[PDB]
Amino acid sequence: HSLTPLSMDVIRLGEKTVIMENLRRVYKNTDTKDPLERNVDLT
Amino acid sequence: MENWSALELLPKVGIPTDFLTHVKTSAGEEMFEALRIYYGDDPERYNIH
Amino acid sequence: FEAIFGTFCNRLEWVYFLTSGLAAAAHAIKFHDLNKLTTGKMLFHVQVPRVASGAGLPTSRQTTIMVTKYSEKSPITIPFELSAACLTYLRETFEGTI
Amino acid sequence: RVASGAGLPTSRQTTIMVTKYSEKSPITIPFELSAACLTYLRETFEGTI
Amino acid sequence: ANIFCTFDHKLSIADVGKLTKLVAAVVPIPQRLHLIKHYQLGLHQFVDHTRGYVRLRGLLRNMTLTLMRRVEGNQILLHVPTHGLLYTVLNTGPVTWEKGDALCVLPPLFHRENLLTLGQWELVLPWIVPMPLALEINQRLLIMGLFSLDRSYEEVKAAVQQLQTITFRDATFTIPDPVIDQHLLIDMKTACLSMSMVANLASELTMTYVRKLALEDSSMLLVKCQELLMRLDRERSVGHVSPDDEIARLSALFVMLRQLDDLIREQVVFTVCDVSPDNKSATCIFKG
Amino acid sequence: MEANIFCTFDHKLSIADVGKLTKLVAAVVPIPQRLHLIKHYQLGLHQFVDHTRGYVRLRGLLRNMTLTLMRRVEGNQILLHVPTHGLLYTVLNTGPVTWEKGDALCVLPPLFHGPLARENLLTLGQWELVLPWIVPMPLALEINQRLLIMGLFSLDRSYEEVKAAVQQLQTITFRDATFTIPDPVIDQHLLIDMKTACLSMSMVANLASELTMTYVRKLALEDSSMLLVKCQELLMRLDARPQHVSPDDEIARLSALFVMLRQLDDLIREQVVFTVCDVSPDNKSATCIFKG
C-alpha cells in the first residue's frame, strides 16, 4: 500500500475542503455522451 | 484522390490535435477538403504494389 | 511537381481512474475472481446514540442494529479488431527484404 | 472511446484522415522608366558637367 | 461464439438451481451482442395483452436462437450454434421427439417447474415441436379465428371445442382459444381478414386475367381454369373497372399475401438424430 | 469444393486498376460456372447485360449464378472466394441501398438511381465490372411484385392506357431513396410467371372455404375501423348461420390453400443469400451469415 502525489484544485467551504473536478477530458472526441450534461423536463 | 495508404505507412509527426467541435462533427459537417473514415482495421495499407 | 509538406498524427491524452478527482469518492479493490461470485454483501454494525431521560418518559434499548448492503454489478466491455493481413505480417515474419 | 455497459451498443474504433491544400495568391506591381532616362543612363557626350 | 448474459436482479439458491436445469435449452435473444442484460433473455419482453400468438410467431422468426451452456456466477453464458454442426438440446415442449424429426419453434401456450421469476420478469422459452404438429396447431388456431364471428350457435361451440383438442403421439392437450372476451386479438384479426381478402380478390380478378393470358396462348391449362371458374359461378348462382382500380386490386392481393408468409411457411430449425431414453433431451443438427 | 477461384486478367492493370480493385475487397461478385480458374470476362454481370432484352432475363440469369467475395488482388490475379452456408463474412454494398440491422438480403440486377452516374468501375477496354445489387428482402419482393403487376396489368392494353400506370409502377421508394426499374419487357419467362399466378389464383378461388370467403362481410357488419374501410373499398365497386360446420373440411381446404398461397408467393419471394448482424455506421459494409 502506497500513495502517489498529484495536483488538483480544492475549494475550502464550511470547514470542509473539497476536490473540484471537470470530466471534459474523458469524453472529448468520444462517442459516448457526458452524463453530467443531461435533459431536465418540466410540464 | 489521395494516397491514404502511404500516409498510414509513412512516419508521422505527433501533434496535440485541436478541433473546436467534435472530430466527427467537423468531419460530418464538411470542414475538410478531403476525408477518409473507416471502422475497424482496414487491410488496405498492407498490400504494397 | 506536387509537394507533401508533412504527415501528422494526434497524440491523444491518456486518462486514468485512480488519478482522477472522481476517484476520491471511491474505495478501489481488485478481486482476482469476481466472476465466481453470484452475490456479495457488506455487513454494517451501527451504534445508535441515546439520551437518558426522565423516569416517566418511555424509551428504547437500541444499542446497535445490523444492516446488509448488496453489491450492484455492472460489467463493461469494448472490442478491438485486427485484420488478417495484420496478423499475417505480425506472426509470419518473412526473412525477406526491407 | 469509452467502454460500454451490458446490453448497449459498443463503439467501433475509427480512423479519420484529412488532407489540407495550399492556396496561391501572387502579387504584382509595375514601375515605368522613360526612354530619356534609359538613354542618359547609358550614353555620354564629351562628358560635359 | 459465446454470448454473456448478466442479471440486474438478486439471484438466490433456488434461482440458480432452477436455471441450471436449463443448461441445454433453446433461449432466443433479440439481436446478436457479446454482453446482454437478462431483460432481453427469453420471449417475455415481447408479451403484451393486445397482440398475442400471431405477433409472437412473427417476432420469434427474426430473433437469434441460442443454447444455454453455463452459469458462472451472476452471469449466464449462451452459445449461438452454426449451421450443420451437431448440438445437444433439451426438450421442454408438450411432446416427445423420435429419431429423424424436423423440429420447429413456436411461441409457448402452456406454463410451472420451468418458470424462473424475478421482478415481474420471468424466463419464457419457445416450444420445440416436430413440423407436423406445428403445422396442425397453426391451422387449428387459424380456423378457430375464422369461426370467431358466429360463436352464437351451439354447433360452432362444439366445433371449436373439437378444434381446441389435438392428440399427438402419446400426448393430448388443448390449444387455447384465440377469442378472449368474445373478441379476437388485433394480429389474429388482421391475419384472418388478410386470408379472406386474398380469397375474395382472387375470385374477382381471376376471370379477367385468365381471359388476358388465354388471348396469348390458349393452352389446355387455361381451358381447365376457365371451366373451373364457370363452375364456381354456377355455384354462386344458387341465390367494367378503371386501370387505377385494377392496379389497386392487384397490389392489394399481393400485399395481403405478404401478410401470410409467416403463417403459410414453416422453418425447420433442428434435425434430431440421437435421443436420450428420458425423452428429456436429444442431440440435433442445427438448421440456420 | 473449389473453395477458392483464381480470376486472371488479360489486360495489364495500371496502378489505378489495382488500387480500385483493392478497395473492392469483400464485394459480392458472381461467376457463371463455378470453376477453379476463370478469365476476367466471365467476372461480373457484363457478359449478360443487354438492355433490349428485359430486366426479367437478367434476373433469371443472375439467380442461377454462383456468388463470390473478392479477396486480395496480385499481379493479374484477383482470387475470388466462395462463401459457405452458416458461416460469417464481411460483405460490401456498392449499391446505394441502405441496410438496417437484422435485414435479410437478396441479389438482384442493378436499378436506375437518380444521379445517372452510377460509378462505372474497371472499364478495361470495353469490359466493365458490373456488380449486382445486394438488396434487403422488402425492396426485393417489392420490385418483383411491381414487375409482375406491370406484366399482368399491361397485357392487352395500348401504350396510351399503359403509360401513366407503368410510370407509376416503375418507381419504388425505399428508406428515403428513389429507384427505377430499367427495362420491364413482357418476356416469355414473365408470361410463365403470370400463368402460374393465374392457376394459383384459380385454385384459391375454387378451394377456399365459405368461412374464408365470407369473414370480411361479417366483420364489416360487426366492426368498423380504418383497416376495414380500406378492405371494403377494395371490394366496393363489385359489391348468416353456416349451413355446414365441418372442422375436417376446414382443415383439408386450409392445408390445400396454404400450398396454393406458397405457390403464389414464390413468384414474388427471392432466395435470401445473406442475413446481416453488424452494420458499419457509414453503411459501406456489413457482417453477414451466408445462406442458400
- 3-state secondary structure string, E239-281? CCCCHHHHHHHHHHHHHHHHCCHHHHCCCCCEEEEEECCCCCE
**Using CA atoms, how far apart are residues E185 and E183, in angstroms rounded to an integer?**
7
For residue F80, list its beta bridge partners: F5, F70
Question: Is E33 an interface residue toward F (CB < 8 Å)?
Answer: no
Rounded to the nearest 5 degrees, what angle is found at the Cα of D16, between the Cα atoms of D14 and D17?
A: 150
Helical spans, DSSP H, in chain F: 15-23, 55-63, 137-154, 159-170, 188-207, 210-222, 226-235, 247-266
**Using CA atoms, how far apart are residues E220 and E228, in angstroms rounded to an integer?**
12
Write the single-letter amino acid at E166.
I
HSE at residue E39, side-chain half, CA atoms within 13 A, is 9
Residues of C within 8 A of D11 (CB-CB) are 78
Residues of F within 8 A of E154 (CB-CB) are none
Whether there are 3 or more C-beta pairs closer than 8 Å between D and B is yes
Strands (E), E107-235: 117-118, 121-122, 127-130, 165-168, 171-174, 179-180, 183-184
Please, what is the end-to-end C-alpha distance for chain D in angstroms?
A: 86
CB burial of residue E195 (10 Å; 0-12, 13-18, 19+): buried
Structural contact between residues E69 and E205, judged by C-beta atoms closer than 8 angstroms: no
Reduced to 3 states (helix: H, G, I; strand: E, B; else coil), residue F223 is coil
**Using CA atoms, how far apart are residues C1 and E168, in angstroms rounded to an integer?**
84
Write the single-letter amino acid at E155.
E
Structural contact between residues E188 and E146, judged by C-beta atoms closer than 8 angstroms: no
* Best CA proximity match to E19, nearest among E109, E122, E100: E122
Min CA distance, C50 vs chain D (Å)? 45
* Best CA proximity match to E281, nearest among E96, E108, E19: E96
* Best CA proximity match to F128, nearest among F52, F19, F29: F29
* Best CA proximity match to F92, nearest among F132, F42, F35, F41: F132
Rounded to the nearest 5 degrees, what angle is found at the Cα of E260, between the Cα atoms of E255 and E262?
A: 125
**Using CA atoms, how far apart are residues E197 and F236, in angstroms rounded to an integer?**
12
**Using CA atoms, how far apart are residues F255 and E204, in angstroms rounded to an integer?**
22
Residues of E within 8 A of F85 (CB-CB) are 83-84
Whether there are 3 or more C-beta pairs closer than 8 Å between D and A is yes
Q: Which set of grid coordinates corresponds to residue C61?
A: 434499548
Structural contact between residues E41 and E27, judged by C-beta atoms closer than 8 angstroms: yes
Rounded to the nearest 5 degrees, what angle is found at the Cα of F189, between the Cα atoms of F184 and F192?
A: 120
Q: Which set of grid coordinates corresponds to residue E148?
A: 370467431
Q: Contact partners of D by the rule of 3+ C-beta pairs under 8 A?
A: A, B, C, E
Question: Is B16 an interface residue toward C (CB < 8 Å)?
Answer: yes
Question: Is A35 an interface residue toward D (CB < 8 Å)?
Answer: no
* Best CA proximity match to F29, nearest among F16, F11, F42, F18: F42
Experimental method: cryo-EM
- Residue of F86, F156, F169 with shortest CB distance to E212: F156
Output DSSP code: residue E168.
Answer: E
Structural contact between residues F28 and F62, judged by C-beta atoms closer than 8 angstroms: no
Q: Cα dist. D26→A23, D21, D23, D29 in Å?
A: 47, 16, 10, 11
Q: Which set of grid coordinates corresponds to residue D13?
A: 474504433
- C35/E6 Cβ within 8 A: no
Structural contact between residues C9 and B14, judged by C-beta atoms closer than 8 angstroms: yes
Q: Contact partners of E by the rule of 3+ C-beta pairs under 8 A?
A: C, D, F
Q: Please provide residue F261's backbone torsions phi and psi, each rounded to the nearest 5 degrees.
A: -70, -35
**Using CA atoms, how far apart are residues E12 and A41, in angstroms rounded to an integer?**
38
Q: What is the C-alpha radius of gyration for chain F, rounded to an integer number of angstroms?
A: 23
Distance of CA C10 to the CA centre of its chain: 27
Max Cα separation, chain A? 52
Resolution in A, one decimal?
A: 3.3
**Using CA atoms, how far apart are residues E135 and E127, in angstroms rounded to an integer?**
13
Question: Is D38 an interface residue toward C (CB < 8 Å)?
Answer: no
Which residue in this structure is represented by grid cell 354447433? Answer: E155
* Best CA proximity match to F118, nearest among F197, F196, F179, F41: F179
**Using CA atoms, how far apart are residues E51 and F93, in angstroms rounded to an integer?**
36
* Strands F66-70 vs F28-31: parallel, antiparallel or unpaired: antiparallel
- C75/D6 Cβ within 8 A: yes
Reduced to 3 states (helix: H, G, I; strand: E, B; else coil), residue E59 is helix
Structural contact between residues F235 and E258, judged by C-beta atoms closer than 8 angstroms: no
Min CA distance, B4 vs chain A (Å)? 22
